[PDB]
Each structure stands twice: as structure tokens, then as C-alpha cells.
Amino acid sequence: TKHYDYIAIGGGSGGIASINRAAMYGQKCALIEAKELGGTCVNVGCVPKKVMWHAAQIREAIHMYGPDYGFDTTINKFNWETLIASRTAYIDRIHTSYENVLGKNNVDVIKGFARFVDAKTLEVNGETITADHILIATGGRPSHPDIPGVEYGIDSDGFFALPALPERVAVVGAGYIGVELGGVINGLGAKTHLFEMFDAPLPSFDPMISETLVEVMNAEGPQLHTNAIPKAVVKNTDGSLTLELEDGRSETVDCLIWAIGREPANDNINLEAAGVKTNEKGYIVVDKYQNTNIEGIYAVGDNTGAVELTPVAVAAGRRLSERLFNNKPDEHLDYSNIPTVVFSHPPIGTVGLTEPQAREQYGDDQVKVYKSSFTAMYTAVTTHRQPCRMKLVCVGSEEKIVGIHGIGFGMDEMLQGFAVALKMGATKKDFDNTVAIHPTAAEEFVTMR
């Protein structure tokens, strides 16, 4: 058997962040990945989605806004194969960068699917390896509905494997992934329909965000269908698929994408053998320091049920290696006020409490909301004017800012800075005392009246 100080199961965001930090303090480490390095983030998530988002932004420039700025252009050809080759080449160069860094840090990368032989032993490819500290960073995977014809839909992994852009696409589920892919496919030219079980897209976000998003979509696509509850998917005689809803609505398309949630990938690794406890949903239960109930086994990232975001798996994975191997016994991630950007059309940025949450937690007379609404300047000189709505949720006399939300051009790059100030306990007067930068969407948050 080969023995290691630390082994990670999963070469995704959690797994790579922690192994490299531990390695960096002299721990002899092994990282085991069953598929490609970079996990979901690099291969079927964050990086390919944002290259697909920029491609959509380019077509809308050529085709929607360019006209009104005076450019008459013909798109002679949209070569999907060229987009997918540039996207894929870039991900192969990121794979090298990672192998390079794991290599300079002496981590042994093992490609195979690890299973637990007992609390301290893992078998991978018939070989048996052991360590004193094992990190399970297996992530998660797409959920699928138990309905007839479910097997005719693909999920977001199948989207990144698409050979061609289908002319008619239905995305079922309007959380992060359906809103983003719905925005992208729509923007790339396909007739898109977005179905959502509930009465609004992005149901859990602040109401101002969901409402603006409905407005924008009614005007530019995708075509939204709320209260949509999938009954079955019929494969038609000509090869198209008809989605049938419980209430009788139906829609016929060329490609159906299920974007209805992610389940955890914890089921096949023979956890029972190690005795690790998972909850009823199947996530590994961890405490505040990422520990499972078995001493020496940790878990970070999407398999734990925490907010499913790459930076969060990186910071909890990295702080776990600090705590364990660099003598900071209390290091641990603070899971509150974590910023998010949805790469929708237009992009959403949120950190903190939604206004509903603040009125529930603090009471109506304590909650003071500022709201600004304007037209993004990029769309203002065209016939496709688009709203930017922004909101600050404040509490108490001090007007301590407890929530910052915006939907508009600019939201993706503006939020980081404001979330550092939120972490610093900014009050509205702190925002008001900073000179604005003109002309930017950003400056609206420091001149809210």
C-alpha cells in the first residue's frame, strides 16, 4: 500500500484548492480524479458557461444593438464548431496549468474512481492507498424528473456536449442554470422556452430581481412559462419532442434541457464502510470545520449541501488545509454574506438578505430599502432599451447595509468591491461618503436617494 499524509477524492474546486495548500506546507499528498481535472467548474460549469455567455453577448452586439449604433452587418455564418474548438482549447490549457501546479507541489494525481475500503483505506484501480487525513470532495450531478420520456431530455452536461445549436430549445427549471442557459441559447438565436414549476423565475431571490427578469424576458426572450409542471415528454414521429404539462399546456421543440437541481455524488463510494454519515438528501453532514463524524475524514464543496459555488469550495478547502497543516486550529469558512453573480441577461448580483428576509428577521420598522431604477447606458441609445434595477436593504438607525442586489449591465464586475465593504460592516453613510465614478452603473449604489 502507499501511505500519504492527505488524500483528496475529487479533482474539482474543493479537492484542488485543499491539496495544493497542504502540499505547500510539506504534506505528501495524492489527488484522485475519475474524469478531468478542474471538476465541474472547469469542464461543464463556470468556464464553458462564461465563454458561451460572451459568444451570446457578441451576437446581440452584431444583431440587436449594432443596428442602432449605425453598424449594418450580415452574419455570413455562425460556425458552432469554431466556438466549441476555441472553448475546448482553452479548457485544455487550463488542465495543463493545473497539472503544472500540482506537479511543482509534488502532489501525485491518480486518475480513477476511489472507493472506501475502511475509514483509512481507499482502493482505486485495484491498488490500495491509505492516509491519515482523507478529504471527500466528490461534488454533485444533474437531477432528472421521474416522468415518462424523461430520457429524451439532456441536462447541463449534455448542453456542453451539443453538436449543433437546436432551432427550438425548452429549458425546464428556472433557477441559476435554466436562467443562464435560457439566456445564452436565446441570445445565440434559438427559439427558447423556459418552464418553471413556481410562479416566477429565480423564485428565492429578492422580488425586485425576479420581477425585472420577467419584464426583460417578455420583451427579448426566452419565453417564460410559470406554474409549469411536467407531465411527460412525447417523442414525435418527426423526431421533435413535445413537453406535456399537468395543466394541459404543451410545447414542441428540438431539444429539452432538464435544469431542475443537482444531487450529491456520494452514493457510489462505499461510505458505509468508512461509517461517514450523510443526511436524508444524501449530503455528507459536516460541522463548521468541514469534519465528518469520523475522525480524519473531511468533506467540502457541493457534496456537503453548502451553497454550491466554486469560490466557496476553494475557500473552505484551503482554510481546512491551513487549520490542519499550518497551525491555525480555528480556521474555517464564514458562510454568510457570500456574494453571487447569475450570468443571466442582464446579469444579477446579490449578497446579503433579500428584503423579505430582512423584514422577517428584523421587523418592518427596522428595515429601510433604497431602490434605483434606470436604463443601462449601452441600451439607451438603441430601440432595445433595458432596465437596471438596484436595491440596498438597510437596518436600524445606523442604516447598517444587510443586503445589496442589482440586475443590469455592469452587475457582474461591480459586486466584488461592495461585498468587501458589506463584510466590513458598511452603513449607507459609508457608501454616500465615497465619490462616484461617472458614467458607470456602479456609481448608482453610492448616490442612492
Ligand X SMILES: Cc1cc2nc3c(=O)[nH]c(=O)nc-3n(C[C@H](O)[C@H](O)[C@H](O)COP(=O)(O)OP(=O)(O)OC[C@H]3O[C@@H](n4cnc5c(N)ncnc54)[C@H](O)[C@@H]3O)c2cc1C
User: Which residues from 402-421 bind a copy of itself, rule CB under 8 A?
Assistant: 410, 412-421
| 438 belongs to the binding site for ligand X (CB under 6 A) | yes
CA distance linking residue 201 with residue 195, whole number of Å:
9
Determine the size of the site formed for ligand X (CB under 6 A): 38
| 35 belongs to the binding site for ligand X (CB under 6 A) | yes
| 437 belongs to the binding site for a copy of itself (CB under 8 A) | yes
Do 41 and 49 meet the contact criterion of CB atoms below 8 Å apart?
no
Do 263 and 279 meet the contact criterion of CB atoms below 8 Å apart?
no
The CA R_g of the chain, rounded to the nearest whole Å, is 24
- Binding partner of residue 369 among ligand X, ligand NAD, a copy of itself, none, CB under 5 to 8 Å per kind? none
Shortest spacing between CB 80 and ligand NAD, in angstroms: 22
Q: Is 144 among the residues known to form the active site?
A: no
Closest CA to 216 of 60, 371, 399: 60
- Output the nine-digit C-alpha cell for 171: 429549458
- Binding partner of residue 429 among a copy of itself, ligand NAD, ligand X, none, CB under 5 to 8 Å per kind? none
> Which one of the spans 41-49, 288-296, 354-362, 421-429 is the region binding ligand X (CB under 6 A)?
41-49
| 18 belongs to the binding site for ligand X (CB under 6 A) | no
**Biggest alpha carbon distance in the chain?**
69
User: Which residues from 314-333 bind a copy of itself, rule CB under 8 A?
Assistant: 314-315, 333
- Binding partner of residue 203 among a copy of itself, ligand X, ligand NAD, none, CB under 5 to 8 Å per kind? ligand NAD
SS3 387: strand
> Which one of the spans 283-291, 320-328, 339-347, 362-370 is the region binding a copy of itself (CB under 8 A)?
339-347
Name which position in 90, 160, 198, 370 contacts a copy of itself (CB under 8 A).
Answer: 90
| 351 belongs to the binding site for ligand X (CB under 6 A) | no
Name which position in 14, 201, 346, 403 contacts ligand X (CB under 6 A).
Answer: 14
- Binding partner of residue 342 among ligand NAD, a copy of itself, ligand X, none, CB under 5 to 8 Å per kind? ligand NAD
Name which position in 282, 311, 356, 387 contacts ligand X (CB under 6 A).
Answer: 311
> Which one of the spans 33-41, 236-244, 282-290, 369-377 is the region binding ligand X (CB under 6 A)?
33-41
Burial of 430 (0-12, 13-18, 19+ CB in 10 A): middle
| 173 belongs to the binding site for ligand X (CB under 6 A) | no
Catalytic residue among 54, 193, 384, 438: 438
Q: CA 133 → CA 7, 136, 172, 277, 325, distances in Å?
A: 7, 10, 41, 17, 10
- Binding partner of residue 219 among ligand NAD, a copy of itself, ligand X, none, CB under 5 to 8 Å per kind? none
- Binding partner of residue 75 among ligand NAD, ligand X, a copy of itself, none, CB under 5 to 8 Å per kind? a copy of itself
* Helix or strand run (H / E) with residue 127: strand 127-136
Closest CA to 342 of 10, 46, 26: 46
In DSSP terms, 81 is beta-bridged to none
Shortest spacing between CB 198 and ligand NAD, in angstroms: 5
Q: Residue 225 region, left (φ>0) first, then alpha (ψ -120 to 50), else beta?
A: beta
Do 403 and 394 meet the contact criterion of CB atoms below 8 Å apart?
no
Q: Dihedral (C-alpha) 352, 420, 50, 218: value to the nearest 10 degrees?
A: 40
Looking at beta carbons, which residue is closest to ligand X?
Answer: 12
Cα angle: 427, vertex 338, 159; to 5 degrees:
140
Do 345 and 376 meet the contact criterion of CB atoms below 8 Å apart?
no
Bridging pattern class, strands 121-124 and 127-136 = antiparallel
Instruction: Please state, as a whole number, how many other Cβ atoms lie within 10 Å of the Cβ of residue 250.
Output: 12
User: Which residues from 355-394 bind a copy of itself, rule CB under 8 A?
Assistant: 377-378, 380-382
Q: Which residues are catalytic?
A: 438
Which residues of the chain form contacts with ligand X (CB under 6 A)?
Answer: 9-15, 32-35, 39-41, 44-46, 49, 113-114, 137-139, 156, 177, 265, 269, 301-303, 308-311, 313, 343, 438-439
